[PDB]
Amino acid sequence: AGAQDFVPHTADLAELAAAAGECRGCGLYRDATQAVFGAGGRSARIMMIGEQPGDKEDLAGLPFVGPAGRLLDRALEAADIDRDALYVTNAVKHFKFTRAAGGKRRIGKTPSRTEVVACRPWLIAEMTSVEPDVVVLLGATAAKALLGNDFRVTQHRGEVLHVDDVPGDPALVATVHPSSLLRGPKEERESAFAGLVDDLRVAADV
Ligand SMILES: O=c1cc[nH]c(=O)[nH]1
Ligand code: SF4
Numbered sequence: 001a002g003a004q005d006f007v008p009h010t011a012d013l014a015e016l017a018a019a020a021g022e023c024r025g026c027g028l029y030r031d032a033t034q035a036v037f038g039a040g041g042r043s044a045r046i047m048m049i050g051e052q053p054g055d056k057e058d059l060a061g062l063p064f065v066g067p068a069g070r071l072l073d074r075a076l077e078a079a080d081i082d083r084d085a086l087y088v089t090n091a092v093k094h095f096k097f098t099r100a101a102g103g104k105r106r107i108g109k110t111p112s113r114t115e116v117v118a119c120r121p122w123l124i125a126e127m128t129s130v131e132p133d134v135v136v137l138l139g140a141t142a143a144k145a146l147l148g149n150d151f152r153v154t155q156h157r158g159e160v161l162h163v164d165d166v167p168g169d170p171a172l173v174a175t176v177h178p179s180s181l182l183r184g185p186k187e188e189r190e191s192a193f194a195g196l197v198d199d200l201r202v203a204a205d206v
Pocket of ligand 2: 025027
């Protein structure tokens with residue numbers, strides 16, 4: 001059941017966000033500061049789904065406000081997408097993290113399939129409320145939530161996909177997680193930014 005009994009019967013994003021603040025669908029609400037719901041409105045045509053809020057998002061109350069969000073904005077700017085058409089959210093709404101003794105920043109830990117399934121009711125409520133025409137799936141965790149734990153982003157990135165079990169049959173475009181463009185060789189990162197831009201353009205023209 002997970003978060004099912006915490007999701008209210010409303011398509012109002014402010015009421016959904018307030019309700020996600022009391023959610024006990026899985027254990028992640030305990031160590032996290034607050035629930036991080038999605039930003040943007042119901043007029044949005046493009047829904048973007050990341051994995052989970054990070055350290056800044058957990059204290060800011062908004063998705064993608066740290067370094068990966070800065071990189072995503074640079075790629076949206078280059079793909080000619082304004083955020084006025086964007087509902088931006090994550091698969092899990094509570095920061096899963098550990099503290100590295102002698103490190104800078106709380107380090108994010110990969111949500112389990114159990115926690116992604118527990119949180120999925122909020123993503124179904126968001127998609128039912130926004131009725132997007134295209135869902136951009138940022139990374140493996142988000143793509144698996146809608147396409148199955150077998151899905152590989154590396155084998156299908158930039159492809160317009162359509163699965164029947166998803167609300168409203170929106171077009172789906174799976175791409176690299178923006179944090180991947182902050183790690184590695186300068187040319188792998190430049191090719192990967194160029195692929196995120198291409199994947200965002202495919203989604204913008206659906
Ligand atoms: O909102 C955010 C921030 C960082 N990484 C994500 O997956 N989502
Ligand atoms: S991560 Fe999702 S399911 Fe788990 S407590 Fe937070 S809102 Fe509820």
